[model samples]
Target chain A: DLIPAPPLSKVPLQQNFQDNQFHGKWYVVGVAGNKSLREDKDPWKMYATIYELKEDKSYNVTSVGFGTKKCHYKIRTFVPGSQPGEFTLGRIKSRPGRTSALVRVVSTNYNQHAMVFFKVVQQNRESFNITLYGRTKELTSELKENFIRFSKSLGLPENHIVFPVPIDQCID
Target chain B: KLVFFAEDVGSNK
Candidate 1:
């Protein structure tokens, strides 16, 4: 039985992700946080997330169908921050009236993986999210363990952990 | 040459 991300993670930022080096396609290994983040009521279904880094450091973020039959495409760009590998992904809105999803690149290995954290800071409330990105659809056990260890530190429960299915591509 | 603002963060392609 899986649960949704709430009470968001409070891990330290990874301040040194390279701009060009981070460019490439990374699949979503795990994602949790922010009460408002898309809900995964059914975790057993195959849901894959794709993060494509453009030549100029921009990002093309998307989600494969899990509960719905349609592909969900999100507009999130990567912008360099003060630190290396540090970046702010463009905001995202799931619907017309929803608040924007403000995301950031907390850290990355510039090769095999990355840890991203994002949040919506508003006057009355705050929502936070953290995700694990992988270079391949099937990450090694070692990498999985590493992700579990770090995610646990963020107070994420084992039951809340979700491993999405790997997809070669997504169709609109 | 990519468009950044898709309105609703990509509600329309």
Candidate 2:
């Protein structure tokens, strides 16, 4: 299969997931898994996602992804899940949509780069999706390399790392 | 709208 292997049993979890430090705008620098977020391949079409903390200690997330034709903007409210860095991420409109998988803030430097991991279950099938988010639309070579190695450590095969083609300033 | 990138080829909107 072209997708990543199943069940990343032991992965790093951000124990002190500071909402304040984590809450901000993030861009999809690179994504690894079975799916690609930048389907349109426009460097300018970066998915700008945000996390807004609420008074209830919950998070209001806005994920803006550009599809083939138009932008698919979704608002998700993720409550604190059992794990320290885990959150019960669900679409507010799709109430309880796919609670089977809780989102985890796996790795982050709290400044330049971050990696988020979550499982998706559809039609009795399951797969893990790991997305590398950055403070900017681009990531430094060092940061990208680190993310790749970190993903491998998390049990995702090296070949499974799918780098999206951006219509922006991205060079190999 | 949330379908896979590979799946969007048929429609390719």
Candidate 3:
């Protein structure tokens, strides 16, 4: 049997979710997953995401971040899913070693903070990665606690949950 | 331009 579904994981997407309102820049202050970050010597320290709405309503996503003090970026697209507030990672290649992922806007106010979930499958490893995106670089302690609680509900241990140190570089 | 930090941080695009 698989891990029992937690209540928080069962929560539905934001009602009447609006993608346009969500398109903008967001700072990733918190990250959590089932995997441990302690072993990794050079993990992502901080990052910012820019979402652009395309003509077809798909999202052109640009992620700029830093790991071990160096800047990096990635470009990807998120196609709208069968239901609102859900998305499927667009496929741009027909080759092996490709990752399969599903994205969901777990909850978002579109102004203050947003909780995003990524169900990832790469190299035959399945994991749930959560990101806490804040409109500003600083987020309230209450919001941070909420993220921690949500991650805990997903069965992630305290060690596996991480509040990556924020940085001044790579704001764009 | 190519964006490379060191490794793929799960953003499989």
Candidate 4:
């Protein structure tokens, strides 16, 4: 199974629904499906989105693709404090048949850099998938290790957690 | 044909 990276050190965990559910940017780290590095080229491409939490407890999510492409848009309503360090992500009725299982903010330095655990949870059967996202590509060694450890704890195979290929332009 | 070249494609509306 995919080995879980060690749990993160430092960074106080927060249970406050208000502070946890605010607008911010996130990156795509990993994906599932039967495809390799050459066949699954698109997975390497980073996707990011900014979410604005509304007063009515909904979110306005705007996604921007990397390498100068137009953005994709969606809106979702989530329940706060549904699970420890997790939230339910679902699309609005206008965009039917779309839902994200769970998004857990596993760890965060609490500013610009944070790690999130995500999976599509539907019909009571969970899949072996998790994504690690950060505001920037440069994540501390501690954060990176913790992310890997967390994935392993979820029973993801070691070979399944594909590390991202670093690009020159990624570092600023 | 939807030809979206570098210059022609404007903001998405």
lDDT of each: 0.52, 0.61, 0.71, 0.45
- Give me the candidate number with maximum DockQ: 3
For candidate 3, the TM-score of chain A alone relative to the native chain A: 0.87
Candidate 4 iRMS, in Å?
12.0
Most accurate candidate by lDDT: 3
Model 2 per-residue lDDT at A37: 37
Q: Write the per-residue lDDT of candidate 3 for residues A45-149, one digit (tens) a residue.
A: 667888898889899888887644577778878888777888877746524776666777889999988888777666776667677888888867898788888
Q: Which stretches of candidate 4 lie over 4 Å from their true place?
A: A1-14, A17-22, A29-43, A67-85, A91-100, A121-128, A165-172, B1-13
Candidate 1 clashing pairs, residues 3+ apart or interchain:
A14-A106, A16-A84, A17-A84, A17-A85
lDDT of 2 by residue, A1-172 (tens): 5465445465668768787788878776766666433435443344666878888768887666666655566565777777666776553432233324457788887788778887755444556767787786666778778878877776666665655444332211
Give TM-scores of chain A for all candidates. 0.64, 0.76, 0.87, 0.60
TM-score, one value per model: 0.62, 0.73, 0.83, 0.58
Q: After superposition, how far is residue A152 of candidate 2 from its true place, in Å?
A: 1.9
What candidate 2 gets wrong by more than 4 Å, as runs, is A2-9, A35-45, A91-99, A166-172, B1-13
Task: Encode model 1's per-residue lDDT on A1-172: one tens digit a residue.
Answer: 2333334345465654556666655666665553422364433333344556676665665555433453444544554544554455453433444444445566788687777765554333444556677776666778677767766776666554556555433522
* Model 4: lDDT of residue A158: 53
**TM-score, structure 1 vs. true:** 0.62
In angstroms, give how far residue A91 of model 1 lies from its true place.
8.6
Expressed as tens digits, the lDDT of each residue in A1-172 for candidate 4 is 2233233332223455344444666654443312222544443554555656766655555544435343343334544445455555544332333334455565555455555544442344333244556666555677667766665565554556554543433222
TM-score of chain B of each: 0.20, 0.11, 0.30, 0.15
Residue B3 C-alpha lDDT in model 2: 21
Top-down TM-score ranking: 3, 2, 1, 4
* Model 4 lDDT tens row, B1-13: 1111010011121
TM-score, chain B, predicted structure 1:
0.20
